Amino acid sequence: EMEKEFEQIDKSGSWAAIYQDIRHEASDFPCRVAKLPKNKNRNRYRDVSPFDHSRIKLHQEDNDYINASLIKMEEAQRSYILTQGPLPNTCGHFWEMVWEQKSRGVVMLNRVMEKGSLKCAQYWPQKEEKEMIFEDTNLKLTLISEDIKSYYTVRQLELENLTTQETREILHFHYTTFPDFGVPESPASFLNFLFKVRESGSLSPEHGPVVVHCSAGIGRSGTFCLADTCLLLMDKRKDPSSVDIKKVLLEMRKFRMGLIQTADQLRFSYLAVIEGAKFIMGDSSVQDQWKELSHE
Ligand code: VO4
Numbered sequence: 001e002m003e004k005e006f007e008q009i010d011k012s013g014s015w016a017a018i019y020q021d022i023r024h025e026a027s028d029f030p031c032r033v034a035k036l037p038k039n040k041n042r043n044r045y046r047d048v049s050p051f052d053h054s055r056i057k058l059h060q061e062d063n064d065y066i067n068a069s070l071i072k073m074e075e076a077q078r079s080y081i082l083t084q085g086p087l088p089n090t091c092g093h094f095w096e097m098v099w100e101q102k103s104r105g106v107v108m109l110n111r112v113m114e115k116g117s118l119k120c121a122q123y124w125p126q127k128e129e130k131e132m133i134f135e136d137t138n139l140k141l142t143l144i145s146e147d148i149k150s151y152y153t154v155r156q157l158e159l160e161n162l163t164t165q166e167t168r169e170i171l172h173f174h175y176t177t178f179p180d181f182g183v184p185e186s187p188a189s190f191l192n193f194l195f196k197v198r199e200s201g202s203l204s205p206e207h208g209p210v211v212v213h214c215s216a217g218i219g220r221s222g223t224f225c226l227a228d229t230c231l232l233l234m235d236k237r238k239d240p241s242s243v244d245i246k247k248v249l250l251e252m253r254k255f256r257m258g259l260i261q262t263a264d265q266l267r268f269s270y271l272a273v274i275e276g277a278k279f280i281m282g283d284s285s286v287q288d289q290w291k292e293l294s295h296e
Pocket of ligand 1: 215218
């Protein structure tokens, strides 16, 4: 059981060890395409690649490569695309993927600048009146409205296939307050954010997979996906205890390497799942407690 194991690991001070065990046991698959020299400038990090078997392919004729993975959670029956923060030359590719995968939501779990560096290209419009055109992929992107809260912002974007003049509404969920070092302020603000994403519909099976990223698309993206899937699972079974966080994580690492980057992120994941489980099991009021504790 989850809380039991949590305290025991806390008491034994062995998160570093537990996490390192997950690292040792994690799947290792080839990333041949990511590593082709022609794709060198499509990767933000040398050490962060999509496996060949689970990578998302652009329907481009030219070069179908983007650093992005399909995490397909069979039992939970939810899918996620995890990707790196777009680069100045892959913003086009990014929206092409969003378009071709029929995604409804984009969860961004980083700020454009962190620790004094540029973690991500400015890949969406910041003002209604300056829409963005992506020439390489023939897509138009327009800011329709935005709802700024204390520690996250939700934007409504319109994505137009210039080739066919067909258009969609994309929801952009931007978590801005994950700390530079350490883990978010509390479970509460993080869970409050996840639940906003869930309520948007962006996770429904009727849409393509939600697109989730931070800078590398593994650490904070891992935490978000792991928590969502774990809660989803205990919701489906209404049995908090059959859910093995570490086992779920290893299952996700079959699809993308390095999900969850620090032992502290792992401990935070437990925290968020344990806390979020309160809501899952019939306690509706807990979600209102997170909204207030998040200070949005
Ligand atoms: O940009 V991330 O994979 O280190 O949280």
